[PDB]
């Protein structure tokens, strides 16, 4: 919430965007890992009583 | 002023190269898996499941 710090920051290009994009990529990769490791079965079988 | 532009552009280039190295490493891993699949599943008959 510093206006002047922003103004100056915009003179350095798209660094901020590139960083944010990278972190978004890793974040969605984590949900991909959990999905691939566990969701290997189509149905939810039940234990016979 | 020139020194300022040089430092900035140099840093942006070094960042690019770093990202390319990481991506290349991941592609290498993929290629290794592809080579294994070609070797075991095409040139023969794999028995391991899934």
UniProtKB/Swiss-Prot annotation, chain B:
Domain of life: Viruses
Protein's job: Subunit of the fusion protein that is processed upon entry into the host cell. Mediates fusion of the virion and cellular membranes by functioning as a class I viral fusion protein. Contains a viral fusion peptide that is unmasked after S2 cleavage. This cleavage can occur at the cell membrane by host TMPRSS2 or during endocytosis by host CSTL. In either case, this triggers an extensive and irreversible conformational change that leads to fusion of the viral envelope with the cellular cytoplasmic membrane, releasing viral genomic RNA into the host cell cytoplasm.
Name of this protein: Spike protein S2'
């Amino acid at each position: 919430d510093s206006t002047e710090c922003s103004n100056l920051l915009l003179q350095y290009g798209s660094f901020c965007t590139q960083l944010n994009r990278a972190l978004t990529g890793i974040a969605v990769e984590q949900d991909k890992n959990t999905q691939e490791v566990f969701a290997q079965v189509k149905q939810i079988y039940k234990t016979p009583p | 002023q020139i020194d300022r532009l040089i430092t900035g552009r140099l840093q942006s280039l070094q960042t690019y190269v770093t990202q390319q190295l990481i991506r290349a490493a991941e592609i290498r891993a993929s290629a290794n898996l592809a080579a294994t699949k070609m070797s075991e599943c095409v040139l023969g008959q794999s028995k391991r499941v899934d």
